[PDB]
């Protein structure tokens, strides 16, 4: 079955940065985008940025393009999101997930991973 | 950016209920496409797919869960609510840079 499995939760001094992973299972990883999502309390969901695994374009929120970094490693079917100069706002579950659709369009997240816990405290 | 705008808070089982999502502007793409999803959390879970294209329900979604809207309303009716239906239901639309959700609408049974 379709999985994508995300790494476990961090704790974080504030000005450090983390790199957390998606590893893909259950379908071909490079013929769909990858999004990744952010969930704090008080604010929903924030749209961060999306990849194309196959190509490794890659595309962002304007208010996530100093902060978030998104790649893919084609060869283990893992897509990762590096944050730098983590602040408390960066206090926040993230999630990575799939796009129903294709490469030229795509319509929603369709399999989403478990959530990242990040926490940044000082 | 567009703003989309849910109520923070919506019942029985087996009543129906529905959620309002209002955009501040229209979601309709060039392609006659209308580029807005529904998506339900389950408590302490991820977010799930209900609709996507405004009215095409996800593969393996319920038929009690519908999706429509016209210009900048939009609209998921749940038929004969569940137990499991029970979450923040978001909506979202991808037809312009940023991508953005509305704030959730919390469906609660009494
Ligand atoms: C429906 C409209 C909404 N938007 C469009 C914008 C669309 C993109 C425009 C640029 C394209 C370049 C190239 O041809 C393709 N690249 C695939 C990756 O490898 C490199 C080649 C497809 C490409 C990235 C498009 C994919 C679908 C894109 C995100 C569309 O969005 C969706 C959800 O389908 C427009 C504004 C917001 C996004």
């Known amino acids: 079955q379709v999985h994508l499995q995300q790494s476990g939760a961090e704790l974080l001094r504030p000005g450090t940065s983390v790199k957390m992973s998606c590893k893909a299972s259950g379908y071909t990883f490079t013929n769909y985008w990858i999004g990744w999502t952010k969930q704090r309390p008080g604010h929903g969901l924030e749209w961060i940025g999306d990849?194309?695994?196959?190509?490794?374009?890659?595309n962002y929120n304007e208010k996530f393009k100093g902060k978030a970094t998104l790649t893919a490693d084609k060869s283990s079917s893992t897509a990762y999101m590096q944050f730098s100069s983590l602040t408390s706002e960066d206090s926040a579950i993230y999630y990575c997930?799939?796009?129903?659709?294709?490469?030229?369009?795509?319509?929603?997240?369709?399999?989403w991973g478990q959530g990242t816990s990040v926490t940044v405290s000082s | 950016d567009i703003i989309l705008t849910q109520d923070e808070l919506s019942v029985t089982s087996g009543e129906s209920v529905s959620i309002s999502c209002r955009s501040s502007?229209?979601?309709?793409?060039?392609?006659?496409?209308?580029?807005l999803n529904w998506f339900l959390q389950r408590p302490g879970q991820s977010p799930q797919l209900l609709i996507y294209l405004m009215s095409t329900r996800a593969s393996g979604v319920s038929d009690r869960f519908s999706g429509s809207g016209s210009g900048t309303d939009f609209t998921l009716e749940i038929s004969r609510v569940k137990a499991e239906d029970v979450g923040v239901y978001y909506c979202?639309?991808?037809?312009?840079?940023?991508?953005?959700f509305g704030g959730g609408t919390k469906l609660e049974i009494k």
């Open positions: 990849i194309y695994p196959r190509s490794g374009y890659n």
């Open positions: 997930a799939r796009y129903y659709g294709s490469w030229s369009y795509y319509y929603a997240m369709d399999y």
């Open positions: 979202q639309q991808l037809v312009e840079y940023p991508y953005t």
């Open positions: 502007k229209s979601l309709l793409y060039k392609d006659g496409k209308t580029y």
